[PDB]
């Protein structure tokens, strides 16, 4: 009973969009979500498909499906069952905030003193980044977004020609050139390579997260790091 009604509920959600795209492209519900404005496919499924299955507080699923959507109108039994998820959302709100707020305070606390105070600490170490690993075909998307804005710790060569110099910001053009050719090793300067745990330099940090260029002296990157992680909690 659980799995037959979960498969039925999930099949309605899959066919909801092609039904909208082929037969009613300008349907208001479709446009309000397909354009990315307000609402996702899950919430529209609650309105035009079926609410599916709920779960009792102790993890287990209820052996009775909600086979009606909000337009049709839930039965008295279905409405009571749907109140299980309503109680969870309000209760889980009271713990998502009190925990993430505590987590954010500790995150800001540990790195509050980290400020860009030097132009170059003078380090020679560099974290090695490799595109090819014989255990998995690397996804080029991850290989790019991590490397953008990093400062090279060593020169990169293609044959007898230098294509990227030490202490040079890694643009997206260089990364694609590295991927296009067989460059197996990239050495970058990261916060792990700075010669200090009380401050960081401009080169070991990299490009500014908002200002486009290299990070500027006197920037409180530690608090920005703490806020950036705790904010989506």
């Amino acid at each position: 009973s659980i799995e037959i009604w979960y498969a039925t509920s999930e099949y309605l959600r899959q066919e909801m969009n092609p039904n909208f795209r082929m037969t009613d492209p300008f349907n208001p519900v479709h446009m309000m979500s397909f354009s990315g404005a307000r609402g996702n496919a899950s919430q529209v499924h609650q309105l035009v498909g079926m609410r599916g299955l709920m779960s009792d507080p102790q993890g287990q699923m209820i052996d009775l499906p909600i086979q009606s959507n909000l337009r049709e109108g839930l039965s008295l039994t279905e409405y009571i069952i749907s109140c299980y998820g309503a109680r969870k959302g309000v209760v889980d709100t009271a713990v998502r905030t009190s925990d993430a707020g505590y987590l954010t305070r500790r995150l800001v606390e540990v790195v509050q003193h980290i400020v860009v105070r030097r132009t170059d600490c003078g380090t020679i170490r560099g974290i090695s980044v490799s595109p090819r690993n014989k255990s998995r075909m690397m996804s080029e998307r991850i290989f790019i977004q991590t490397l953008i804005g990093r400062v090279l710790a060593d020169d990169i060569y293609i044959g007898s020609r230098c294509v990227a110099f030490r202490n040079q910001d890694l643009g997206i053009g260089l990364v694609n050139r590295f991927i296009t050719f067989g460059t197996q090793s990239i050495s970058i300067r990261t916060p792990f390579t700075c010669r200090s745990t009380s401050w960081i330099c401009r080169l070991c940090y990299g490009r500014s997260p908002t200002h486009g260029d290299l990070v500027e002296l006197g920037e409180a990157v530690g608090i920005i790091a703490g806020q950036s992680i705790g904010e989506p909690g």
Binding site: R125, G126, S128, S185, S187
Partner: peptide, 21 residues
């Protein structure tokens, strides 16, 4: 992962430029 074998780990650190002679 750095391999559990100590000498394989040393060779990995040499290849990954973590540490060298």
């Amino acid at each position: 992962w750095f391999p559990e074998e100590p000498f394989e780990a040393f060779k990995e650190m040499r290849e990954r430029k973590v540490f060298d002679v």
